[PDB]
PDB file of C-alpha atoms in Angstrom:
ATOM      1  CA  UNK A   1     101.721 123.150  96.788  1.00  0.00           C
ATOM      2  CA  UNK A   2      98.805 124.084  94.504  1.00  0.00           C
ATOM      3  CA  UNK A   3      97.496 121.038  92.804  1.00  0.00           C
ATOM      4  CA  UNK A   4      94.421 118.786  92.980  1.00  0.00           C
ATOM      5  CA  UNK A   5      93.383 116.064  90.495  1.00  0.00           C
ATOM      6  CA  UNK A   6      92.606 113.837  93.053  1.00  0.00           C
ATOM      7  CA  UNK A   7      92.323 109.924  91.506  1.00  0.00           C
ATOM      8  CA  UNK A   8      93.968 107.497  93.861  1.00  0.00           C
ATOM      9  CA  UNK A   9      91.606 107.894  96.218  1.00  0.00           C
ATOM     10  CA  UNK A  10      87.907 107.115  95.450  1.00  0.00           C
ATOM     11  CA  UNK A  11      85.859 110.272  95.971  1.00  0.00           C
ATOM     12  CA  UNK A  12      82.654 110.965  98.268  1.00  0.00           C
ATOM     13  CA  UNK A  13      79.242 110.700  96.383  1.00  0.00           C
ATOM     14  CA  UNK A  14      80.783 109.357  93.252  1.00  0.00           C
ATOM     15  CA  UNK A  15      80.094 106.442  91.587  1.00  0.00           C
ATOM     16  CA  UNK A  16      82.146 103.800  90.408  1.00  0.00           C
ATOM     17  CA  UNK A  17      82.576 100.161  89.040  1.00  0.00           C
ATOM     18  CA  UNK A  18      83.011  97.164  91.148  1.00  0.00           C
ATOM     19  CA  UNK A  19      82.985  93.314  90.987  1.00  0.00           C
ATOM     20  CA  UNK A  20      82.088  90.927  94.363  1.00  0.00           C
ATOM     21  CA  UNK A  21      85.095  89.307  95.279  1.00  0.00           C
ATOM     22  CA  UNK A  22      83.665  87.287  98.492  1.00  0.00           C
ATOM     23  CA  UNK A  23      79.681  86.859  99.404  1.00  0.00           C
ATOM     24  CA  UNK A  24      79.579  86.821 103.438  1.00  0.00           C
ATOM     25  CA  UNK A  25      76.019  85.542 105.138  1.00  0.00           C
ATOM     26  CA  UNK A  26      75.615  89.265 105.611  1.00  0.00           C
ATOM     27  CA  UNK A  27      77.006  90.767 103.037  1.00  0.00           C
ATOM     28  CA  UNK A  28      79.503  91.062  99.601  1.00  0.00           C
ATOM     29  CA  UNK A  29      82.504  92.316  99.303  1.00  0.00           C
ATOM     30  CA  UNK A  30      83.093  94.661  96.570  1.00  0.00           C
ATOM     31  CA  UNK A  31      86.349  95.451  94.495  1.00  0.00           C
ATOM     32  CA  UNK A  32      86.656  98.846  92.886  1.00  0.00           C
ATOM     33  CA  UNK A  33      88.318  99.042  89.408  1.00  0.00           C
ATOM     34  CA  UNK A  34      89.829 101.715  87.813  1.00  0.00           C
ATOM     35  CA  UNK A  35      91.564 103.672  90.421  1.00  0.00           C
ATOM     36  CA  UNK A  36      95.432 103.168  90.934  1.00  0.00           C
ATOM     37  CA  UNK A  37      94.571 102.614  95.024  1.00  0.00           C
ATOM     38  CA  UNK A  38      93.209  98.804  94.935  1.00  0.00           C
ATOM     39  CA  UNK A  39      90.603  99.435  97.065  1.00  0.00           C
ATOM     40  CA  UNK A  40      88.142  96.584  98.436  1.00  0.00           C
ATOM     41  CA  UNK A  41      84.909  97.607 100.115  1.00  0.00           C
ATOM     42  CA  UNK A  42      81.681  96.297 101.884  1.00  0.00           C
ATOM     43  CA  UNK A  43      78.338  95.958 100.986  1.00  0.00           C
ATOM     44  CA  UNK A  44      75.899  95.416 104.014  1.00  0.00           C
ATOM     45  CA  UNK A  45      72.697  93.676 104.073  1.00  0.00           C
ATOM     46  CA  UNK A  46      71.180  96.592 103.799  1.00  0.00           C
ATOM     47  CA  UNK A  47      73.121  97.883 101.255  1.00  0.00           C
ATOM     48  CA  UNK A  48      71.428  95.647  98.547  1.00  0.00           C
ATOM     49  CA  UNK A  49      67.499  95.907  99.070  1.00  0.00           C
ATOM     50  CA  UNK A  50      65.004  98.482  99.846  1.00  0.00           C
ATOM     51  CA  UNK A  51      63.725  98.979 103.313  1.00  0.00           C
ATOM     52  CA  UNK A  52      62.925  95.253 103.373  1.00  0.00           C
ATOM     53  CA  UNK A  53      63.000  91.713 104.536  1.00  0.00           C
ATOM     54  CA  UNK A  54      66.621  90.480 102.825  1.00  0.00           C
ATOM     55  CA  UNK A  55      66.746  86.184 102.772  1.00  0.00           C
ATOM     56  CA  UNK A  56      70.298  86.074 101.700  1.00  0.00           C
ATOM     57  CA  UNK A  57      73.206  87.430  99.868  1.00  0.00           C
ATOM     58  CA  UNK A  58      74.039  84.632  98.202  1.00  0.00           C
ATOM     59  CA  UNK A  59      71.152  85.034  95.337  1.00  0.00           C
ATOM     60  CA  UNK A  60      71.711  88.869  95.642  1.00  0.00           C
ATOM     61  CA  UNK A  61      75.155  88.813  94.365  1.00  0.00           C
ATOM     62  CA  UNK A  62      77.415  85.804  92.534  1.00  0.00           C
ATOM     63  CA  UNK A  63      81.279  85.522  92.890  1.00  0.00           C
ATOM     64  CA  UNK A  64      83.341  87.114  89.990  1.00  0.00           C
ATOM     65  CA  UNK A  65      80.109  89.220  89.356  1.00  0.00           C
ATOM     66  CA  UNK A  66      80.211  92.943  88.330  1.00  0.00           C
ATOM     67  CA  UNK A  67      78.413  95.394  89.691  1.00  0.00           C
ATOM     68  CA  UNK A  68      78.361  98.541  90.010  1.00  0.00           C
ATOM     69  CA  UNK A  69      78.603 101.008  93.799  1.00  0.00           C
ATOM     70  CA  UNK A  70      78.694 104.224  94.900  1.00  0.00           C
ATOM     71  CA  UNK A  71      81.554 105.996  97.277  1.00  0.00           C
ATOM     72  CA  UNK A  72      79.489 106.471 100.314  1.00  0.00           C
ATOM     73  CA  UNK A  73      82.507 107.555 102.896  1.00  0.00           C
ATOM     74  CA  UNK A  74      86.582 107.106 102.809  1.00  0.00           C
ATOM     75  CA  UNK A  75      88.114 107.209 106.015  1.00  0.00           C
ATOM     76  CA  UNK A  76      92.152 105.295 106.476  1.00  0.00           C
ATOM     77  CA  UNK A  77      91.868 102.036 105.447  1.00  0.00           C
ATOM     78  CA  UNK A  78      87.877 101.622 105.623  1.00  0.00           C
ATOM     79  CA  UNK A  79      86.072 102.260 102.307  1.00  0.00           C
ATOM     80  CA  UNK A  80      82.363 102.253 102.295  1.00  0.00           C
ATOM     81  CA  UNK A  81      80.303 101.306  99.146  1.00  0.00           C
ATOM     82  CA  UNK A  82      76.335 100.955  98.657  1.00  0.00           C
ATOM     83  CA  UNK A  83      74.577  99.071  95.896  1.00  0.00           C
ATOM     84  CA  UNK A  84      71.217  99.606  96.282  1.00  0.00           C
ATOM     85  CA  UNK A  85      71.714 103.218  95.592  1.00  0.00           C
ATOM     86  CA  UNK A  86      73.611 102.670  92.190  1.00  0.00           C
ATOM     87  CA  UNK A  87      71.155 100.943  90.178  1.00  0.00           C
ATOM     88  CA  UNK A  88      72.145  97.896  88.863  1.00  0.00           C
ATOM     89  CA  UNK A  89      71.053  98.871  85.019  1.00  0.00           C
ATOM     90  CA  UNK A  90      73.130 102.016  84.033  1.00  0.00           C
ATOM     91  CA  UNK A  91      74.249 102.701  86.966  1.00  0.00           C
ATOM     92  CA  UNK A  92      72.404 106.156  87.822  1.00  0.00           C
ATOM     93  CA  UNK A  93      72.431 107.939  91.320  1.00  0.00           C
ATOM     94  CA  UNK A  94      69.171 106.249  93.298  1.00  0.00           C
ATOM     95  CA  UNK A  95      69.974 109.295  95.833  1.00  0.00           C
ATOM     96  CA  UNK A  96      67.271 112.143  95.856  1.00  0.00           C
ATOM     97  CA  UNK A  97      68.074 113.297  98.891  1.00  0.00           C
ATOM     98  CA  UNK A  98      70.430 112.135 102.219  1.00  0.00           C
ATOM     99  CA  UNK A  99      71.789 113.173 105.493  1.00  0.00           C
ATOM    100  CA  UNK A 100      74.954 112.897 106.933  1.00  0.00           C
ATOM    101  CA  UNK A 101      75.031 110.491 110.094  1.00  0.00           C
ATOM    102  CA  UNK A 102      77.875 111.022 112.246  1.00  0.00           C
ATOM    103  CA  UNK A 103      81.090 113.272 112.547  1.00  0.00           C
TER     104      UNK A 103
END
């Protein structure tokens, strides 16, 4: 049928609130609130600093800590979520300009 509204799935170049639930040696991982869907995603190493030299996660992000991530890319059960791009102040898009990587 006709109908949209979508909500229980995060949505593609949104942004939306999170809190790091585990920090790995390479990255954190990142629970998204709000949505119905309990989703959990990923933040790489290089998904927390500019084009860099990165020592460790560990001082980049505490456990229980809020933060806040952007919906890079939902696919099945893998849900993608960047950092670096939603600053960490009010939470505006860092993204000017991007390309899509693979399809």
């Amino acid at each position: 049928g006709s109908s949209g509204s979508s909500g229980e799935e995060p949505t593609i170049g949104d942004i939306y609130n999170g809190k790091v639930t585990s920090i790995m040696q390479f990255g954190c991982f990142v629970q998204l609130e709000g949505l119905r869907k309990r989703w959990e995603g990923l933040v790489h190493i290089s998904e927390l600093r500019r084009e860099g030299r990165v020592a460790n996660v560990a001082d980049v992000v505490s456990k229980g800590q809020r933060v806040k991530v952007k919906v890079l890319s939902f696919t099945g059960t893998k849900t993608s979520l960047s950092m670096k791009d939603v600053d960490q102040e009010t939470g505006e898009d860092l993204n000017p300009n991007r390309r899509r990587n693979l399809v």
